[PDB]
């Protein structure tokens with residue numbers, strides 16, 4: 001299992017290593033790009049040729065509040081090769097920059113997208129759309145308010161426009177926590193859990209929608225077009241799960257080449273106090289679930305979480321499931337099923353060392369285009385002032 005050194009980065013919190021960095025690492029053509037905060041809090045951008053281990057690294061003019069692990073960096077490359085990057089939010093005005101030129105690590109000034117509803121941003125996420133355009137998703141609101149906002153970047157006009165103002169409706173009652181993926185056919189997939197009130201134990205259910213027209217209209221797997229916005233009552237339930245089953249929020253999802261969705265998360269068995277890793281997927285006709293490992297060690301979300309929220313990639317039913325577990329010494333770990341429906345899941349460790357509070361993020365585009373799995377790997381703590389730890393790209397042997 002081959003580790004490619006990048007550079008040392010901040011490790012006192014998990015800001016560089018959350019599951020919801022979309023993306024920390026991204027390939028365009030034969031170049032791979034990475035982003036992180038250095039030990040002084042500066043946003044660093046880097047790139048290499050995929051056939052080299054020599055990085056060009058550039059400390060930008062920007063800093064982030066790295067003591068708040070919410071305040072992540074998400075990046076993406078558009079069809080003309082410009083880096084788009086958004087960073088350093090926890091209910092704050094939008095921070096968004098772009099490369100000054102194709103493939104450049106140098107950024108211009110902070111810019112608006114649409115200039116509307118950009119005062120209270122959390123969780124910036126980018127996804128590439130067919131033809132070179134980009135999608136941007138974020139949570140708008142402070143003091144417990146949350147709403148999913150979705151924009152599109154037209155490569156042609158070089159501008160952002162709003163796609164949905166209200167896609168998921170909490171009806172002034174509840175919040176949602178979501179994840180998305182744009183499949184190899186350009187379909188946008190969306191899944192989420194509800195959170196009924198302040199407390200994490202009030203998370204419940206896994207819901208799903210998809211769009212074939214870059215976010216304008218939305219469908220269920222069973223073919224019905226949604227009447228928007230999507231509420232508790234009309235949502236498609238991929239998996240019905242109660243409150244108080246240790247169901248976690250804000251994980252990740254993927255799809256196979258055929259456009260079938262796969263969702264990776266965790267929750268406990270009814271007759272147990274031990275959360276277990278899960279996969280939920282739809283085969284075109286039915287939703288299924290499987291438990292990935294047989295953990296022994298209990299924990300509860302109520303009141304550092306001992307396991308990481310997961311990532312997955314899929315190849316025609318074959319699943320590679322990336323996680324981290326105190327039971328395995330907090331190494332980077334992988335579970336593999338030849339066939340998601342029927343195989344036993346074989347577990348291996350991808351690092352021989354602990355990465356502690358690390359969660360996985362991966363080069364989504366390299367998997368889609370080249371079927372290679374590269375992970376952003378760095379030891380971090382749930383913040384003790386520790387020395388910055390080396391960031392690697394882990395090039396996975398499968």
Ligand SMILES: [Cl-]
Nearest residue numbers: 001002003004
């Ligand atoms: Cl190595």
Ligand SMILES: [Cl-]
Nearest residue numbers: 061062063064
């Ligand atoms: Cl700054």
Ligand SMILES: [Cl-]
Nearest residue numbers: 146147175176
């Ligand atoms: Cl929300």
Ligand SMILES: [Cl-]
Nearest residue numbers: 127181182364
């Ligand atoms: Cl994607």
Ligand SMILES: [Cl-]
Nearest residue numbers: 256257315316
């Ligand atoms: Cl596939």
Ligand SMILES: [Cl-]
Nearest residue numbers: 285286287288
């Ligand atoms: Cl079903």
Ligand SMILES: [Cl-]
Nearest residue numbers: 342343344345
């Ligand atoms: Cl088997």
